[PDB]
Structure formats: C-alpha cells, structure tokens
C-alpha cells in the first residue's frame, strides 16, 4: 500500500496516513484514518492526541473546523489494523469525522507573488489542550479535500432571452472534464433594427468568496471573438469549441485553482456541488462554472460543470515529471 508518513523534525511523533485525498460525497464525507506513533519515552507523563484545522489563510488563518480526539486514554478500519500490527504495540490510532456542508480545498492563483481553503493535520503532545507548543515538537501534514464527477449525467443546458431580436443557446452535455472542449450552439433569430457584427462567447467561473458578506467575481478563463455578422430579417446558426486551460491564464489575477500541497501548479478549480435541500452559510469558497454568449447588448447564461472524474487508482497530487 505504501502509506504516506510525515516525520517531525525531532526524532519522535510521526504520523501515518493511508492517503492524502479524501473525496466529498453529496451526503457523507470519508473519515480520516491513520496512526500517530510515540516512543515509550517523552510520553510516560504526557498524553498524545491529534487536531486538524480548516484554515482560511488569506494574508489571518480564520479557522473553520477544529476537532480533537484523544489517542491515549469505536470500530477501526481494515487499514487501521494493518498499521497497528506492522508498527507494533506502541502505536495509538487516531480518527476524524468531517460533517457535510463544508467548502472544498480550493486555492486562488497569485500573480508575480497561499490564499484559499486548506486543511492541515497536526499531532502534538500536551495536557492543557491550549499550551503554546513549538512547531518543532509537532507535525504539519497538508491534506486535500475535493470532489469528483458523478456517474449520472445531467440534462442538456438551454437558455432563452428575447429582450433587445430572439436568440437561444445550448450545449452538448453538462458533465465536462478538465481540458475537454466546449461546444455551444449560437442559433440566433434576429428580426430587425441592427445587424450584429460579432459573437462574443466566453466561459467564466464564479468565485463566491463567502468569508463575510458575499462575492460574485467573474473571470473569463476562455473566450473567442468570431467576427461573423447576422443579417436583418434572417436566420443564423454556428458552432464553437472553447477550451479552458491555464497556458494563457498565467497573467490573470483572482483565478481559482484546485487544491495545493506545495508550490507546484495545478489545474482550474473544480466546480463545487452544494445540497439543494440545505444551502446554509458556507464561510468558504464556492466555485461554479458558467458559459455565456454576447450579441453586440444582450446575453444569456448556461450552467455547466468542469471537474475531474473518479481517479482509477490514486492521485499523486504533484506534476509527475518533476525537476
């Protein structure tokens, strides 16, 4: 299995994790499992326990989720038994429970010089649960929490607007994976007044930062400037292929990306799916994808999602051909 471990700077208090990618289902969240190891010394008068933080460092780490469980005085998973058997008797398990309605791990893109929702799992030994402990006698293992594409495809999007002519738009499908081109139908039924000389088709995602008040930020990740012109009292139709990628979006600011583990670069932020029956205050970041066409003005909005499917084996969470 080759679980992931993060040894502390001092020769003690290591933590074992079977994975660093916890999926977020619509209903429940996969619990965090692992083993923290403590030597017989340094512990005879102390007690070991763990703590995870839902940091919101935007510099100012506005913590959101804090949970503490004591590993040194519930059922245990199969991987939990294997670690206990292999490591030895002097190993005390730790587990975590994540409730729903929490934001996923998304990090905004900075320019020429992170900020976003990140989760850190730290283990330290004390009694007062509030004593100031140095980072040397602790571990700092970063975990990621993301969502993946659902099995059931969604309905074909379709918009409508007749304000000033009459135009309609549609997409091939709702489920889009990262890097896949987007096909849009821009069939217009203009009747009179003006002959529109351009068709602006742009893809934008919503960076709904809901830290305190609200946010509806707009970023045109992909766009095009086709110079086709409609005619007065005539019909028109056209297709297009826009692909949202990161090669031309390096200079942009405020762009939302996927979860981060180091200074390595990632793809665009996956769309976040909330609960229809329960939409309370998130205090995080919500990312939703929208495709629009503009007649030059009038425009329409067509929903769509852009996020990865279920990985076959496991994500390394790092660009594979490094250095």
């Amino acid at each position, epitope marked *: 299995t*080759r679980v992931f471990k993060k040894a502390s700077p001092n020769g003690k208090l290591t933590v074992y994790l079977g994975k660093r990618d916890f999926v977020d289902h619509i209903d429940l969240v996969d619990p965090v499992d692992g083993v923290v190891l403590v030597d017989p010394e340094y512990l005879k008068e102390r007690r070991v326990y763990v703590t995870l933080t839902a940091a919101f460092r935007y510099g100012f780490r506005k913590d959101l989720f804090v949970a503490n469980v004591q590993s040194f005085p519930k059922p245990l998973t199969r991987l939990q038994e294997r670690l206990i058997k292999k490591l030895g008797e002097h190993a005390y398990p730790f587990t975590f429970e994540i409730p729903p309605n929490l934001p996923s791990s998304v990090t905004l893109q900075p320019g020429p010089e992170a900020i976003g929702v990140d989760y850190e799992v730290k283990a330290f030994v004390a009694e007062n649960l509030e004593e100031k402990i140095h980072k040397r006698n602790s571990v700092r293992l970063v975990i990621e929490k993301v969502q993946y594409a659902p099995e059931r495809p969604g309905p074909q999007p379709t918009a409508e607007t007749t304000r000033q002519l009459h135009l309609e738009a549609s997409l091939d499908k709702e489920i889009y*994976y*990262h*890097g*896949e*081109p987007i096909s849009v139908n821009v069939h217009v039924t203009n009747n009179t007044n003006k002959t529109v000389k351009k068709i602006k088709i742009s893809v934008r995602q919503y960076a709904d930062i809901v830290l305190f008040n609200t946010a509806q930020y707009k970023v045109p990740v992909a766009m095009e400037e086709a110079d086709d012109t409609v005619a007065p009292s005539s019909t028109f139709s056209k297709v297009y292929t826009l*692909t949202p*990628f*990161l*090669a*031309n979006n*390096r200079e942009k600011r405020g762009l939302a990306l996927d979860g981060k583990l180091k200074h390595e*670069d990632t*793809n665009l932020a996956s769309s976040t799916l909330l609960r229809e029956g329960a939409n309370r205050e998130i205090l995080g970041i919500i990312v939703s994808y929208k495709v629009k066409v503009k007649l030059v003005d009038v425009a329409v909005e067509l929903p769509f999602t852009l996020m*990865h499917p279920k*990985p*076959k*084996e496991e*994500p*390394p969470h790092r660009e*594979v*051909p*490094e*250095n």
Partner: single-chain antibody
C-alpha cells in the same frame, strides 16, 4: 540522472513457465514505473502504468511488485504472443530513461523522414485523432537500430511546458497546433548519431499514467 540495468539481457524460455524480469533503478523512486512490450518491427505497448496496476486490455497474467527499488514483471504463462524486448521506465522525473531491454526467447499517424546528411534539417509530423491536445501530453521517443528506446522531447499544451533531452537541447524544437490536432518536431544541425526510429507517443495530461498509444515508425537515416 537515473540509470536502469536489467539483470537478464537475453532470456530463453518455453511455453508454460513463470518468467520474471527485474528492474534496478539507481535511485529511490516512487511506484511511478511503467513496463513496455515492443515486438520487432512495431511500436511498444504499455502493460503496467503504476508498477502494480494492470492496463485495460492486457491479460491478468501480467503482474508487478515492489521491494524497495526492485521493480519486476512476472508472467504466469509465456504464450508465443509475448516474445518481445521488454523495457522499464521511470516517469517520476523529466529525464525519463528506458531500460537496456530484456530479450525473451484513437490512432496516431506520423509522416516524414528521409536520408539527410549532417548539417541539414528535417521536419516530422505527428497527426493525431480521437483525443484533444489540451487533455493529453505528446511525447517523442527515438530508438536506435538494435539499441533501446531513448526519450527526445515532450510537450504539455495545458500548462504550455516543453521538455527536451540533454543531448538534443537547442537543436530540437517541438510544436503542436490545437486546430488540426497535430504535433510537429523541428531538428537543427543533425549529427551522424541521430539515425533512429522516431515514435510519437501520447499520454494523459492530467495524472500522467504512462504512454498509452504510440506510432508505427518514421525511420530516419543520416
């Protein structure tokens, strides 16, 4: 860099035996090891993309295991359909290296290649269909006559990154257009050691899992 040596260079076996080929990398790499089977006069075919996960299509008899850095390939039964020079790769770093080769005893179209004495320039095309440029990574691999596979260049259109081998730096330039879904390779000041069969292989841009598809051959003589 990383150098790989395979203990069995020339292996002879029969039908109905367990043949095991090992692989020793001169560094502590992760499970990012891929095994390729290349029949004579044909492009290599991927077998295992994570040193433990079998590819979709290959039989379940093939299997791999790890012990420190002791990557190996185990074959339950050696039917005659599996006689080829197996290779061994590490895709954990930019200078991907293939093994010396163990002798056992969506379509990509490429056009170009010809007799070009040194000092000339040659342009190779890699026409592709069935997949998108932004959702895949294009890799160019050359194979000298009788030698093993050697990595030449690679391009990633999603992040706009280009990688070249240390022996073809500056001389070789790779470009790809998204409109026609084609990969183009430009080489300048060709030396006499460039005589090799050039293959254009694709890979998944997101979460690289080996070179799934290959070409057929663009033999270049210099």
């Amino acid at each position: 860099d990383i150098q790989m040596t395979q203990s069995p260079s020339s292996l002879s076996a029969s039908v109905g035996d367990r043949v095991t080929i090992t692989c020793r990398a001169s560094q502590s790499v992760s499970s990012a090891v891929a095994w390729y089977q290349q029949k004579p006069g044909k492009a290599p075919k991927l077998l295992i993309y994570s040193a433990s996960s079998l590819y979709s299509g290959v039989p379940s008899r093939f299997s791999g295991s790890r012990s420190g850095t002791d990557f190996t390939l185990t074959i339950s039964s050696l039917q005659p359909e599996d006689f080829a020079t197996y290779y061994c790769q590490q895709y954990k770093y930019v200078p991907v290296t293939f093994g010396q080769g163990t002798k056992v005893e969506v379509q990509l179209v490429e056009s170009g290649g010809g007799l070009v004495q040194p000092g000339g320039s040659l342009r190779l095309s890699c026409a592709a269909s069935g997949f998108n440029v932004y959702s895949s990574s294009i890799h160019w691999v050359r194979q000298a006559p009788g030698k093993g596979l050697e990595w030449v260049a690679s391009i990633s259109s999603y992040y706009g990154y280009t990688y070249y081998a240390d022996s073809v730096k500056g001389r070789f330039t790779i470009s790809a257009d998204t409109s026609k879904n084609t990969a183009y390779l430009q080489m300048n000041s060709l030396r006499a050691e460039d005589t090799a069969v050039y293959y254009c292989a694709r890979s998944r841009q997101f979460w690289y899992s080996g070179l799934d598809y290959w070409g057929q051959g663009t033999l270049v003589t210099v």
